[PDB]
Amino acid sequence: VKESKQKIHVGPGELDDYYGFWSGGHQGEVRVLGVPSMRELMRIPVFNVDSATGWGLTNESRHIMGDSAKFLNGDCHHPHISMTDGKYDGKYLFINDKANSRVARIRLDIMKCDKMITVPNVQAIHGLRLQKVPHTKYVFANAEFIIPHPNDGKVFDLQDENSYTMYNAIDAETMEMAFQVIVDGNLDNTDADYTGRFAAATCYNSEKAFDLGGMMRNERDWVVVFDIHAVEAAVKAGDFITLGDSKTPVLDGRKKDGKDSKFTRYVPVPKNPHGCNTSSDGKYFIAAGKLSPTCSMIAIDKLPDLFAGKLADPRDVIVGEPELGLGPLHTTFDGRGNAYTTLFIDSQVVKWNMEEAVRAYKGEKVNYIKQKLDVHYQPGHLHASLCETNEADGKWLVALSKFSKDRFLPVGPLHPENDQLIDISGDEMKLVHDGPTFAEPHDCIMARRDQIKTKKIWDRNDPFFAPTVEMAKKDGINLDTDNKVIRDGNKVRVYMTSMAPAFGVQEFTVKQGDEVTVTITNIDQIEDVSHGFVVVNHGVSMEISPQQTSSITFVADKPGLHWYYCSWFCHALHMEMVGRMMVEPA
Amino acid sequence: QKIHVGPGELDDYYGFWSGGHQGEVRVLGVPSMRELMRIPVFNVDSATGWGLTNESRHIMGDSAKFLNGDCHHPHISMTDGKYDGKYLFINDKANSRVARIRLDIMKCDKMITVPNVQAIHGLRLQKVPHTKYVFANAEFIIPHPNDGKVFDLQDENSYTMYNAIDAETMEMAFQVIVDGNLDNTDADYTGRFAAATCYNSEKAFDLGGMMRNERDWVVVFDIHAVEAAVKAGDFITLGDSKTPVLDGRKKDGKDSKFTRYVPVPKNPHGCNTSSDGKYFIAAGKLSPTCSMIAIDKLPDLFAGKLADPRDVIVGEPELGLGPLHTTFDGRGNAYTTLFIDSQVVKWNMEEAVRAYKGEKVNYIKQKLDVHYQPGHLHASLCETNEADGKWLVALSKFSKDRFLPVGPLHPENDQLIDISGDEMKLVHDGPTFAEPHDCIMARRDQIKTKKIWDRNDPFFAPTVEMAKKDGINLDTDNKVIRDGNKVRVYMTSMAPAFGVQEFTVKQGDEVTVTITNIDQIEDVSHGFVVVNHGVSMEISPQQTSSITFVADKPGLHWYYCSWFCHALHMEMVGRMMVEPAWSHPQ
Ligand code: CUZ
Ligand code: CUZ
Ligand code: CUA
Ligand code: CUA
Ligand SMILES: [Ca+2]
Ligand SMILES: [Ca+2]
Ligand SMILES: [Cl-]
Ligand SMILES: [Cl-]
Ligand SMILES: [Cl-]
Ligand SMILES: [K+]
Ligand SMILES: [K+]
Ligand code: NA
Ligand code: NA
């Protein structure tokens, strides 16, 4: 007998116990919450354009985004923290972009997106998870949609032999592509084991159809399992192809005339399975059945035998398939032997014992279902604290539901999502908080307070703005001290320091049509004294936090006097922290 | 007073938070302080497609080219000095705009760029007999014309103007040229008078210059006199704008018919009408005081019956360091933020008024420490004669240690204070992104929202007229219209299927996709994303939405529904097929 009775109120002056990193869904950002208060502490722009910080407007951010800076949107579902020996190391957060086919990396010491990649020769990055062991060497990412190769407009048929999608591995540290694996069917969600050898992904479109009925035709789709050791061996030996103008090694993981690839095995699983979740004891890949009212449990310790050809049937790695309820979508773990699964249709979270499900599969009469909790309403992902690590602590559970209906004040035709906090510390789940959120977070991830270490002020050598420091070097500029205007034909480069309540350059004059770059170094050393920079009626806006250098480029297309001001309230004389751009007529 | 809203309980008040330089409006429930909705206004919203869709860009006009805004001052329309819940208005200081939000659909439905001005900062609404005018301050002095010949702020044609917008039409009504500049503004409870603070009476551009005078002033506007001069045709126009412009400057020491200038120390900031209608209260900022202007003495001031503009001042209580803003409990007490001392001071207005007559009396009742450096503050219904004295939000600019570390950029701290009793009680610390400046609360029963769209809503009526030219009936048609190098796709949607699931175009075609969500069930919203084309929008039940993009890439391109709407949501998808340009003319 142990009861669920954790404190939920975080009063003035008290601090949260966990960080929560919420995906922003089709709003495109990442949100940092405090747990258990469920208050949003910070927003990290990633695929959105952020008016406040200038992400998407500044030269530093557009350099990280590359050519994809032309997009103003993203759709990000699956945030994950890098690991060392199967435990969070607090270094990086990665997330997908389903809308423009990207993966982004966030540095958790500065809480900024510091790298972004457009995955080549695919459409729509959905599923994303990280290698756990020995550490996060690879980010694994699913491309969801089957497309022609090449996609040059000659062939549109998804049944053609060169229409397919690929599993993607990105080098976590360099954020360059490592390899791609062609698969049969498509790819939904993915997870990795606790050794580094295996990863797995659900497939819902084994039919390679484009219509709803066609995509639901097969009694079973599959989870495809990847022998990452085998893939690495083939890349190391150089036997791969490349596609288009991308140098990424491409390996063929499709079945050929019934014959298995070295790189993959296809484990039949009902039906349009969705979630793909590694148990924290590392025993199971658990696929949520969605259209089937089940989960399927793949025994990871049978996968070597499967790939060695020792097993008569790929279904032999299935060791449990418990019946849970209508519309299972995702599963998480308390570290105590229980799994917790969302039932989208029944609108519940079901708590069940994994080892008892395995014994039921053998035909033992044993009830593995422990409890069903109503949630509100239609849950998608759920996440228990540290569930993606061998330190899963069984304390907090968030169920992220898609219809809030009557749970909050009405706010028009568009409704918030309902992310509900559930106490799982004891024998019974207890619903303790309804958290409304914008734009459909899909998944979230929690970390202990002590697993995240952040900078209080920027380092002057930070790679985030090192290209800008390089530009300054070519102009002979010492960013820490200089207040100067460089003139270069019709280009103008303003460099200034800033120190509340004054910009270091408070007026400058240019010619109508000049392309103006303004670089600002915040030389305040007091924590929290951020500055801003807005040029009135020019669409220019950006953050400069303590010891940061930030820069932005715009064309002075309007003759006359044009004011600029500090947007970050920074001092009693904030309103007076202004300057003038004077534009001489053409 | 209930502080906590548990699962299944609803908040008692709506809160409408400004987003500051993040550019949106945020809808909170009070007292839980949870964010229920985001309403994009000057920001580009990836989730709903605000700034990408044709409906939103139509409302933004040419200013749709800007991806940023800086909004500070949200206010709710009134009838006879009470909220009527029809509209919310807000400023854009970055690109000189005013936006209107329709509170039944919680969307921005109108936007205006204020002509011949730079930086719309202060904004407030006429109270009586209703909100006929939106009053808005242009903060920065500029030359007229601003054509690059003259830059001097001391030129006789360099000035700023006070701005009145017709609330219902969202067209300019008039502009009043003023001496000095403009900061914040409020209106009386008769409709005759508005008032604004000025901090740059010096017409300087440097910090020392702007602080030189011991007093600036609050300028008072006789709206009756302005309206009468407009009716009589007694006005000019500036540049290409037909807005009536009136001259409220002093000339050679003689007052305008339209304005009186009340000397007030010192770089004063907040300008707040007491809920009993007695006072304009200006916060002294650099002077440790507030100055109370007796509204019932203004008739005598404009009739030349007073010896000295100071004679309308009837109190100037000393409150503490850095008074910024004042609000009201409706019980005769005022509450003022002290930015420097980092407190809210509660004081009794009538006792301050007799202390100004020399009657020694302690008008200060309590000082509450806030965390840290408060800017605006807001008591529930403070802007109406229904000011109820229950809740107070102080919106602070430095959160320092009050929340978990999240890197060099910190959240703001908006603190909920119980003022229902004699003693202010700090109950909740609410972290927020991007610097909310002001917020406004409304009782739950003052806001009436629509659960699904009306098919004749003006928000998308232009789109309906477009469809009519094509013979479309949006409620039923699934058609692809071709028109040269334009393609107009019209479809219905109903979970989990798009009404048009594939279409074919030529490379280079300009494609418009119009979607009408014909689901009738509340909260069943759909989305639309074209992979790798930067296209994303919301379509909520009974809404029509449209978006335009170029099919610049040959081949098959998937589109999908971004709003989780159904168990088969992963499968609500379609295909755009783009025929290569080398197979088509040119
Ligand atoms: Cu993209 S899917 Cu269950 Cu993760 Cu939401
Ligand atoms: Cu724009 S100022 Cu006190 Cu309102 Cu923040
Ligand atoms: Cu710098 Cu406010
Ligand atoms: Cu329509 Cu999900
Ligand atoms: Ca299938
Ligand atoms: Ca002054
Ligand atoms: Cl998953
Ligand atoms: Cl238990
Ligand atoms: Cl104010
Ligand atoms: K939703
Ligand atoms: K701040
Ligand atoms: Na990159
Ligand atoms: Na307009």
Curated annotation (Swiss-Prot), chain A:
Return the InterPro entries for the record.
CcO_II-like_C (IPR002429), Copper_CuA (IPR001505), Cupredoxin (IPR008972), N2O_reductase_N (IPR011045), N2OR_C (IPR034205), NO_Rdtase (IPR023644), Nos_propeller (IPR041114), NOS_propeller_2 (IPR041142)
Which cell locations does it reside in?
Periplasm
Q: Which UniProt keywords apply?
A: Calcium, Copper, Metal-binding, Oxidoreductase, Periplasm, Signal
Q: Where does this protein hold Cu cation Z2?
A: 77, 126
Task: Tell me the enzyme class.
Answer: oxidoreductase
Q: In which pathway does it act?
A: Nitrogen metabolism; nitrate reduction (denitrification); dinitrogen from nitrate: step 4/4
The cofactors required by this protein are:
Ca(2+); Cu cation
One Pfam match, by short name?
Answer: nos_propeller
Q: Which reaction does it catalyse?
A: N2 + 2 Fe(III)-[cytochrome c] + H2O = nitrous oxide + 2 Fe(II)-[cytochrome c] + 2 H(+)
UniProt: Cu cation A1 binding residues: 531, 566, 570, 577
What function does the entry list? Nitrous-oxide reductase is part of a bacterial respiratory system which is activated under anaerobic conditions in the presence of nitrate or nitrous oxide.
Q: Which PANTHER family match?
A: CYTOCHROME C OXIDASE SUBUNIT II, NITROUS-OXIDE REDUCTASE
Protein name, please? Nitrous-oxide reductase
Q: Which organism is it from?
A: Stutzerimonas stutzeri
